Amino acid sequence: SQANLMRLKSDLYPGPTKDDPLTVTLGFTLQDIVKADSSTNEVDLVYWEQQRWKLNSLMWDPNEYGNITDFRTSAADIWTPDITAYSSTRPVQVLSPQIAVVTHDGSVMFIPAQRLSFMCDPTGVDSEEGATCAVKFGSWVYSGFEIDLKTDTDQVDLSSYYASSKYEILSATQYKHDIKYNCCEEIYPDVVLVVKFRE
Amino acid sequence: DDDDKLHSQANLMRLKSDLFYPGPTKDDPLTVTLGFTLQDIVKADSSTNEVDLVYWEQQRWKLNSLMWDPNEYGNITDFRTSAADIWTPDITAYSSTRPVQVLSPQIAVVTHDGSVMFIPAQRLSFMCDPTGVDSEEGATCAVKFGSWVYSGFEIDLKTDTDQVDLSSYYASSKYEILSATQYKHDIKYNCCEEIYPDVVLVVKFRER
Amino acid sequence: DDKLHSQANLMRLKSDLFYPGPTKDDPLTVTLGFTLQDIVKADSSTNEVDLVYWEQQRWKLNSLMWDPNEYGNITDFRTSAADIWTPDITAYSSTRPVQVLSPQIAVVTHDGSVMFIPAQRLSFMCDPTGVDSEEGATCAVKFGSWVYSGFEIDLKTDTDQVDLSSYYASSKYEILSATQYKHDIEEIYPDVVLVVKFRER
Amino acid sequence: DKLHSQANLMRLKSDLFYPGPTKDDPLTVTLGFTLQDIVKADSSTNEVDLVYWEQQRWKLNSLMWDPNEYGNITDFRTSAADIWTPDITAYSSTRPVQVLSPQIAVVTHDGSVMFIPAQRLSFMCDPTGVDSEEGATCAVKFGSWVYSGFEIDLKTDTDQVDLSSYYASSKYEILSATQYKHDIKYNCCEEIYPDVVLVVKFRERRAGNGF
Amino acid sequence: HSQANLMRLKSDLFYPGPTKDDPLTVTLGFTLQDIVKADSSTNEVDLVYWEQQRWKLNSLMWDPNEYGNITDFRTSAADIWTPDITAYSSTRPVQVLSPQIAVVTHDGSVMFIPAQRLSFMCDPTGVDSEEGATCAVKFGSWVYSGFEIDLKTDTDQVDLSSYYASSKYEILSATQYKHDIKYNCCEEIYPDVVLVVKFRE
Ligand SMILES: CN[C@@H](C)C/C=C/c1cncc(Oc2ccccc2)c1
Ligand SMILES: CN[C@@H](C)C/C=C/c1cncc(Oc2ccccc2)c1
Ligand SMILES: CN[C@@H](C)C/C=C/c1cncc(Oc2ccccc2)c1
Ligand SMILES: CN[C@@H](C)C/C=C/c1cncc(Oc2ccccc2)c1
């Protein structure tokens, strides 16, 4: 079995293009609003960012490789999408191992846990209505012609939100948007995390 | 005796050469045993609900690919090597708020039965409300550790004891430990069909 | 299978393509432009201000040109900025190493032009005295090559005005003006100076 | 003359360029401390921050050469990544140690290696009494992380911490600094475990004659 | 052709460091840009400066006529040997602010000028007075004695022409002295450049 897996990895990409486009499914699990800094208007979130895509170049017949259906690999061994927060104020801090799971249908699952500081005015967090902040996520360099974005849900997963956080969540959504600018033909997709929260 | 030193060096260089794994799978699963030694609660931040711990995390597992016959290598029964030279499990704190900081050399002990012992010392900031730390009852917080990417079918996560080792806890810490346990749990996450085991550190502590 | 032939055509283009840097005999022009997104922090105890901006860099190399007809009508591609030469554009009065906020990926076009737009957070030398007033404070930071003179790298801009169309509307600081004039100082030394006037919102 | 020396060194390094010690091939590592500053004592977390230079010396037969075969070269400098180095560690640090000096060692023709990293360390210390005439006392143990005294035999040249470079205008005055060597034995196991413990007694410079 | 000549030069060119019988002279000088912060709770002061370093290697020499008149080039500092110049009383690792690129000239000389931010041991008592505070920090090789690295200055006057005019701290004087210490047992001398700065709020 080990030899079959090693042989699979040895047998097993310049990224997508207009002629070979890719869809990335994105979802957030929001774990904690750690800090809300009203002297700089930065808020700090901890979340898990679920990323999934599929490549034909990663497919294999399991019967040809000892009935292996999936395996774990360094995210450095594979191409990964350049999904970026568009209004961060510090480099994102990676909180989980940089490992992805590849399946024989060519699909890749990668779920980095991250701490993010982003631009957010927390005025109102000390009130019943709370504060509201938003941050857009998408590719930094690819348009909708190379990378399209999808979600499995428009509701952020709050099932792991820390119940004794300094801040409680009033709502958290991850709506996808496809923006067409008047100037260009390409669509520009994003997924926007919108969080309403209070002390 | 200078020659003897030369021969044991040669035998070790040859063993390491001969030995130097793709990770576990449903069909080649791995048991990883975890144990914690809590050394210090450094800081409790009630403005962000983050607590900072220093601990040693004992990890051990066994690989057939790391076994050897000592009689073929000058009766070498174990050796030390950089953790970079070997596969290591992706044991992760599930509720950290900053990347974990490693305090010790990343070096493992490999024994001729293929067992590996790796014990990194770490400083961890994790989600924890310290309300009550200034009382006789104290505060109580938990943090889960487990593989980030391997389900229970690939890595089986065990302990040797339900008790966190406090015998090296810093006696002049700002915080005294009232109790510390490390029980196992099996959890279904929304991403994935398969169950993931963890070891959950539960710590009750108060200002000294 | 068309998708598969485009992948192979791109792999072949990148192999075919993969420059010692400019010289006095082979000089390079780098176009710079700034998009200011946020004034995060102004520290009056140290006279350091913190900016987040996107720095657009463009240049063109003959060694990166290709014929699209020979590579499947491929007119451009994305590639890691480590695969290519990049200019050593530096803030001249930073007080902390610049922090990169965006993937280090450039777009190369068939005519040999390159576009690279790193988002950055920068602390730089700036006295915010007067930021708590209607007139606000004014600060400046120069950007340019660290090691090349004007003989090897000349700098251009496409505009004298900093792009504020993405400036954070609920920042602690509002922008009164932001300009990016080019300045020249045996060899000439060019820079692009970011001058910002700002005040507490 | 310079060129022949440079050639001879390139040839020596190529000729020369160890799996670490074992019970059958133990290594003596000599340790010493030069304490340069107590920077900060934090009574809200019981952490104290030190700057020191940690001298490490050991000797390998595999690094020996005859100076006569290499143009009389008797010493050279090399990246400490180019060689094995011992896994000497503070046993009660609270942050990763920060290395302040270049990671370069000096190798001598008898096979001896000298490596002296300057370091900033945060470690567990209750500074109670630092604002009094008697001062505070902290201690931090240094030793191998994974090797017993039967693999790494830890020694010192002196029990005295070198204070000759202690910063004269530090916020903290040093009352004493020792580096005594200790051995610990477990009934289970035949191996003895050595450490060198840095013990520092210090006070706020304004606490001396404080009234 | 110019590019081919440069790529040939660098391929022809691409040092184990000095020894007693192959000593190297390193010339050092400082451009002081800012005193950012003076922390009287820990007696640490934070400087931003540019550290000019120059040395010469016979193994980096070439004939400009054999290489198309090329007289110098830029190269990553990781491509060449560089001296281990270190502050002797830093309290945090130095932070590099500029690209790590050096200029190599056909005579074998190398010029390398890193911009750095340095926290060092310094009591700022008196900085709030007319007389100011005075602090000093030594710079030199960590691991080489004067038998291997001979340290020199071109001048003892610290370059203040780029000092930030709205710093929280004004410079009363800055001097870089070529200093050494010798232990009577032994022939080796241990040189340094002592940077002495007198400053005030
Ligand atoms: C214990 N970790 C949870 C808290 C969150 C993450 C799970 C995970 C992360 N990265 C890849 C991924 O991928 C898989 C693909 C196929 C089958 C199973 C998992 C799973
Ligand atoms: C959605 N993107 C923003 C938040 C800004 C950053 C854009 C960018 C950065 N680097 C290259 C570049 O290049 C492209 C060329 C053509 C089409 C799209 C982008 C684009
Ligand atoms: C534009 N940056 C300045 C404000 C400060 C630094 C200049 C510099 C840094 N590193 C090498 C060096 O070398 C060269 C040699 C000859 C001509 C030009 C520069 C120059
Ligand atoms: C000028 N440096 C002091 C402030 C501290 C460090 C010295 C040092 C560090 N690493 C090796 C060592 O080794 C050498 C052996 C012989 C002669 C010179 C040094 C010396």
Annotate the secondary structure layout.
Five copies of one chain form a homopentamer.
Chain A: H1 2-11, E1 22-37, E2 42-59, E3 70-74, E4 83-85, E5 93-94, E6 99-103, E7 105-110, E8 113-119, E9 131-139, E10 147-150, E11 168-180, E12 187-198
Parallel strand pairs in A: 1-10
Antiparallel strand pairs in A: 1-2, 2-7, 2-8, 3-6, 4-9, 5-8, 6-7, 9-12, 11-12
The structure holds (E,2S)-N-methyl-5-(5-phenoxy-3-pyridyl)pent-4-en-2-amine (4 copies).
CATH homologous superfamily of chain A, by name? Neurotransmitter-gated ion-channel ligand-binding domain
The structural domain count of chain A equals 1
**Largest sheet composition of chain A:** 8 strands, mixed
Distance between the termini of chain A: 52 Å
CATH topology-level name of chain A: Acetylcholine Binding Protein, Chain: A
Give the names of the bound compounds: (E,2S)-N-methyl-5-(5-phenoxy-3-pyridyl)pent-4-en-2-amine
**Helices and strands of chain A, in N-to-C order?**
HEEEEEEEEEEEE
The assembly state of the depicted protein chains is homopentamer
Structural class of chain A: mainly beta
Helix content of chain A: under 10%
- What is the overall silhouette of chain A? globular
| CATH top level label of chain A | Mainly Beta
Report Rg of chain A: 19 Å
Beta strand count of chain A = 12
Count of alpha and pi helical runs of chain A? 1
Strand content of chain A: over 45%
The CATH level-2 architecture of chain A is identified as Distorted Sandwich
Largest interface: D-E, 36 and 29 residues
Domain Neurotransmitter-gated ion-channel ligand-binding (chain C): 19-199
Disulfide bonds (chain C): 126-139
Keywords (chain C): Calcium, Metal-binding, Receptor, Signal
Binding site for Mg(2+) 5 (chain C): 152
